[PDB]
Amino acid sequence: DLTMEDLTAKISQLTVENRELRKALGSTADPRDRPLTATEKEAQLTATVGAMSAAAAKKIEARVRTIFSKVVTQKQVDDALKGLS
Amino acid sequence: DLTMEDLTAKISQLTVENRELRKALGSTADPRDRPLTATEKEAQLTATVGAMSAAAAKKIEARVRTIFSKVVTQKQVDDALKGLS
């Protein structure tokens, strides 16, 4: 009947519990138990993607240099690229 | 029996023959049969790398995101990155 207000009250109950969890995670002796903000979580995600992407770019360049070293002409590049597919 | 001069004599014979075969290939009728130059081959090489590296970066980023979608604390992040180094 009062569906809107029930969903709002659901957020209120989920919000108070949400912070009661955060206050308990700050009461532990381990600093690494702190909940990360969405900003810090994105910075560590971006740095993680950047590291693995650089690692993937390293192996990819060596892999296709292996196939390109044999080619000398146009047609041969295409068959090497098709060999990469 | 097998001296060093034997190897360098064969190396010279192949270099002078490869120089000639290129000059013949460079004088062919069809322009697509001409051998690629060193920079042209290198330019198409990095172009192939950069294309695959960009596509690999997308799969890496979307993969890291679905892993970060189930973490909150610094301890959870460190354990989520432990399997996927």
Curated annotation (Swiss-Prot), chains A, B:
One of its GO terms (molecular function) is double-stranded DNA binding. Coiled coil: none annotated. It is found in: Host cytoplasm; Virion tegument. Changing V77A: Does not affect DNA-binding; does not affect ability to inhibit host CGAS. Changing L81A: Does not affect DNA-binding; does not affect ability to inhibit host CGAS. It comes from the Viruses. The keyword RNA-binding does not apply. Keywords: DNA-binding, Host cytoplasm, Host-virus interaction, Inhibition of host innate immune response by virus, Phosphoprotein, Viral immunoevasion, Virion, Virion tegument. Changing L7A: Does not affect homooligomerization; does not affect ability to inhibit host CGAS. Belongs to the herpesviridae BLRF2 family. This is Tegument protein ORF52. It comes from Human herpesvirus 8 type P (isolate GK18). The chain holds residues 11 to 95 of 131 of the full protein.
